[PDB]
Write a protein that binds this DNA or RNA. Structure first.
Lengths: 55, 138, 144, 97, 225, 67, 101
RNA sequence: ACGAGACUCUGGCAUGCUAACUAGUUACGCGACCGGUCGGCGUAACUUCUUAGAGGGACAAGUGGCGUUCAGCCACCCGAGAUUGAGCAAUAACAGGUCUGUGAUGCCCUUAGAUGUCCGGGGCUGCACGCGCGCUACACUGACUGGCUCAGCGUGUGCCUACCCUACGCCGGCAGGCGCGGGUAACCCGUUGAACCCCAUUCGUGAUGGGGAUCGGGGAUUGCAAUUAUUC
């Protein structure tokens, strides 16, 4: 219902447009390979995605 | 048709395609002496006068080289040329002349036909280089 | 006999091509010779005053070494170090308009010209003349 | 504030068909592409979620910026009673469980 | 779809992570152990390894149907192509998550932390594991939080053999006074061509076959078989 | 440092003790027999055991062996 | 079409090798002329993150690496025979795609 | 028994093997002088350079010296290599940091500020100041068209969104716009034509062509307004 006050400034060019896909975190977001992950969540689900610590 | 001999230094690698000829030497559109540096030129000339012009007078070898840097592209052309000559002689004419030239090249420079194993080392975080570390205050 | 381009010392070779370009005059006369700063990275004066002729000769050298080069590529052979002032240096592409005008000076003049489908075609007149220039440079004072 | 009855009936039928509906709390999107064409904003999802939370006829689970409802037997009974639907309406497919 | 394979694989990994987290917050109360995803032409099958197959299947075959719908809204997969199979685990006492959730429910079911840890230790050694550790941390007594360890058998902590000879499960346990942490680490035994251990031994272990006991001949003879 | 570990030393000791007859003075034959008679999961570990086996055989060639 | 392309994308070398061996075994069961399994360069997805979920400590960086392996086979066979060949034996972890060549 | 080592990935050698018009080496219709430059082509010698797949290879293995005449260390014909670099990494702990990741959390906010919706505007971009990391300079081993020669890691066509790398020609000394598009990628950028080495012409011990708020005016991106304006 809040459509005549919000959308007063389109949000598609800043860090507000991108959020962590797990905790809605806009800090420390990883956008490589479309991950859309934050560091804590990425290392939380690092082995599940396919990356493994070997180097 | 190549003698299938190759030659490397750093990430660079050169191979001398080999055929029967009269000792005309060419490096990627240019002969062995018109290489640009004109100060590394002696490094390219090392074999052809290390063993003489006569040995480079009955075989046509074209050295193709792909790699990084000027000097790293060198030490590949020369080693490829020398090791191509030694392999051509070994597989075609005899070993006695081949053994003589191999001994000559090794005595002048033992790394004349063996590759230089050294490669650039990886970089570790908390420092710009492989062994350099970021400065911090105590 | 015959002598090609690549087996000639490139320094006096490009000097000879520049001199041949000055002597010919068959090209479009350059309209900017010193009013530009040439390369974007370069904020210092040009000197030779022949940079249009010498750059045309350089372009010809670069399409003979590598057929198919044009503007967008010519910028990539004429790019250089860019000192960003207080910040460190980087790489900068040259002037695409300058290389484009050089090509248009070359284009359709019967030594080299770039198509609209891809690649470079070399006419017999231009290649014969350039090989003869290389041979004259080689056998004149570079080989006896 | 005036949450539509027609939109409620459509939402209830969509939930009854399969057992879940595309629920998000983001306001930057007015209507989801599946939720569009029927006047379904973010606040409609919020109100349905909270009403069913207090009702308890479906159990809520939140995971990765998404919601999931557990449609119970009591949920089906209350949905029929308040929507006045026929009694032979029930998601009971058997193929490829 | 047309897609660069790097993005394809990372998005597939994100898809697997989404499944795993949704089911861990979803299917845990049903003896959840793990999930195996098979890719067949234009469809993905989801075989569920879980110690409680009857609980997940449920009455009327209800829940195992509903799940297929609940993911369908989120993933946006084509209809009919998605299906799941609920199976009983093939690794009962050697899948770290199984006994981690077991301990979660022991602590939830009014059973003492030390007693629960001792019981799972007993069960794990009864399965035949070469060692186990249960690091439980939290306010076990008072308000000064502390750790608490139950190490038995043996256990490797370093090197590559840790990845495949050790099953590690880190879980958060509910408590009245706070949130406890549980780390259940099981060193899987070794069996060859079997179903309970890795097919390769510990690289630091060398096993020697006992040589034959043949009597040394003392006079050459001609043997006619 | 090139000091042998008690794992390599112990395995080579057991190999000499139990399979003396097949073991020879050549390193490569020692490597092959150690691969054939024992499960050594690493080529590097195989080679370390074979080298200690060779050195032990030279030690017996000197005469008595204390270990 | 006569020229069929079989694409094998796998993060695990063992499963990719087993799948390639099974495909070549199937193409050996029925006499079919096959080109050897072309192995393209692997793709190393090196991405580096900060170990700690905060700013405290030394500069510690996790270096996560995902390796992607690529196989290509080109055959001269009708679509029915290629379809029969593909789904004869597979192992999870490898992605198989059939393309027109 | 754990840790160390072993382990795995890496860096180096196999002209041994399974082999590759998404890679080249070999296949030739100006043979331009009567044996030659090609990626100016003059439009079926097969895996050697390239590609990481399976095996192999190095073990202090041989010689000499020292040494409980041990464990080992040092020097050498030989050999690709005689110490590659990392990953993991025990027992215990610290009132180390993290409630700025969430019904993963034990306490206050309940009476119209309960955040579940929201912000028009400024904050850490501005200050008498002290500090910490690093860059541009410390010279005529430096510079004033740079004319000719190369690789390496690796990223890139997107459904929350034109929101990519861009090859080629047009517009201008210029940021940028137009078109055809090549690339979902060893298929295109890309043979990834920068740093550099050269010069039979031009700097010469300044405060400056070794240099930056070179003060102020000319610029602008298929996207909320570049304000002590982080783009130019």
């Amino acid at each position: 219902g809040h459509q005549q006050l919000y959308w007063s400034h389109p949000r598609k060019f800043g860090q507000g447009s991108r959020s962590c896909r797990v905790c809605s975190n806009r800090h420390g977001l990883i956008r490589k390979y479309g991950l859309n992950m934050c560091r804590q969540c990425f290392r939380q689900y690092a082995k599940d995605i396919g990356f493994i610590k070997l180097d | 048709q190549s003698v299938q001999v190759f030659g490397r230094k750093k990430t660079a690698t050169a191979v001398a395609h080999c055929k029967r000829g009269n000792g005309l030497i060419k490096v990627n559109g240019r002969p062995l002496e018109m290489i640009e540096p004109r100060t590394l030129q002696y490094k390219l000339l090392e074999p052809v006068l290390l063993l003489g012009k006569e040995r480079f007078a009955g075989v046509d070898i074209r050295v193709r080289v792909k790699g990084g840097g000027h000097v790293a592209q060198i030490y590949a052309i020369r080693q490829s040329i020398s090791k191509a000559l030694v392999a051509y002689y070994q597989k075609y004419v005899d070993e006695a002349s081949k053994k003589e030239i191999k001994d000559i090249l090794i005595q002048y420079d033992r790394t004349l036909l063996v590759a230089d194993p050294r490669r650039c080392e990886s970089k570790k975080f908390g420092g710009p280089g492989a062994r350099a570390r970021y400065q911090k205050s105590y | 006999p015959g002598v090609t381009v690549k087996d000639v010392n490139q320094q006096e070779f490009v000097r000879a091509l520049a001199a041949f370009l000055k002597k010919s005059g068959k090209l479009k006369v350059p309209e900017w010779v010193d009013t530009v700063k040439l390369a974007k990275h370069k904020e210092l004066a040009p000197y030779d005053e022949n940079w249009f002729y010498t750059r045309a000769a350089s372009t010809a050298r670069h399409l003979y070494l590598r057929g198919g080069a044009g503007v967008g590529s010519m910028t990539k052979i004429y790019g250089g170090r860019q000192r960003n002032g207080v910040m460190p240096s980087h790489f900068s592409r040259g002037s695409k308009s300058v290389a484009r005008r050089v090509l248009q000076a070359l284009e359709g003049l019967k030594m080299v010209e770039k198509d609209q489908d891809g690649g470079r075609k070399l006419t017999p007149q231009g290649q014969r003349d350039l090989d003869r220039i290389a041979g004259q440079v080689a056998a004149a004072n570079k080989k006896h | 504030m005036l949450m539509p009855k027609k939109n409620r009936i459509a939402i209830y039928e969509l939930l009854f068909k399969e057992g879940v509906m595309v629920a998000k709390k983001d306001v930057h999107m007015p209507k989801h592409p599946e939720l569009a064409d029927k006047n379904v904003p973010n606040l409609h999802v919020m109100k349905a979620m909270q009403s069913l939370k207090s009702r308890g006829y479906v159990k809520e689970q939140f995971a990765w910026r998404h919601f999931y409802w557990y449609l119970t037997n009591e949920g089906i009974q209350y949905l029929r009673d308040y929507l006045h639907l026929p009694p032979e309406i029930v998601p009971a497919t058997l193929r490829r469980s | 779809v047309q897609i660069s394979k790097k993005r394809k694989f990372v998005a597939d990994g994100i898809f697997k992570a989404e499944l795993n987290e949704f089911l861990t917050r979803e299917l845990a109360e049903d003896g959840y152990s793990g999930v195996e995803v098979r890719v067949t032409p234009t469809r993905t099958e989801i075989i569920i390894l879980a110690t409680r197959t009857q609980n997940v299947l449920g009455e009327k075959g209800r829940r195992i149907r509903e799940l297929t719908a609940v993911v369908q809204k989120r993933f946006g997969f084509p209809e009919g192509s998605v299906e799941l199979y609920a199976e009983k685990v093939a690794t009962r006492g050697l899948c770290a998550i199984a006994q981690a959730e077991s301990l979660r429910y022991k602590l939830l079911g009014g059973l003492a932390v030390r007693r629960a840890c001792y019981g799972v230790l007993r069960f794990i050694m009864e399965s035949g594991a070469k060692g186990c550790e249960v690091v439980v941390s939290g306010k076990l007594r008072g308000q000064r939080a502390k750790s608490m360890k139950f190490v038995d058998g043996l256990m490797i902590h370093s090197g590559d053999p840790v990845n495949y000879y050790v099953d590690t499960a880190v879980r958060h346990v509910l408590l009245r006074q706070g949130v406890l942490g549980i780390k259940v680490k099981i060193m899987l035994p070794w069996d060859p061509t079997g179903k309970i251990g890795p097919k390769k031994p510990l690289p630091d272990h060398v096993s020697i076959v006992e040589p034959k006991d043949e009597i040394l001949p003392t006079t050459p003879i001609s043997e006619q078989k | 440092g090139r000091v042998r570990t008690k794992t390599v030393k112990k395995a080579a000791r057991v190999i000499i003790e139990k399979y003396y007859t097949r073991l020879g003075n050549d390193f490569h034959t020692n490597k092959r027999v150690c691969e054939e008679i024992a499960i050594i999961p690493s080529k590097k570990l195989r080679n370390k055991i074979a080298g200690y086996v060779t050195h032990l055989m030279k030690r017996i060639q000197r005469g008595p062996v204390r270990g | 079409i006569h020229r069929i392309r079989i694409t094998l994308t796998s993060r695990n070398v063992k499963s990719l090798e087993k799948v390639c061996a099974d495909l070549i075994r199937g193409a050996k069961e029925k006499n079919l002329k096959v080109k050897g399994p072309v192995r393209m360069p692997t793709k190393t997805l090196r991405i580096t993150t900060r170990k700690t979920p905060c700013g405290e400590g030394s500069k510690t960086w996790d270096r996560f690496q995902m390796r992607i392996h690529k196989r290509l086979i080109d055959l001269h066979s009708p679509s029915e025979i290629v379809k029969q060949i593909t789904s004869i034996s597979i192992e999870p972890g490898v992605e198989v795609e059939v393309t027109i060549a």
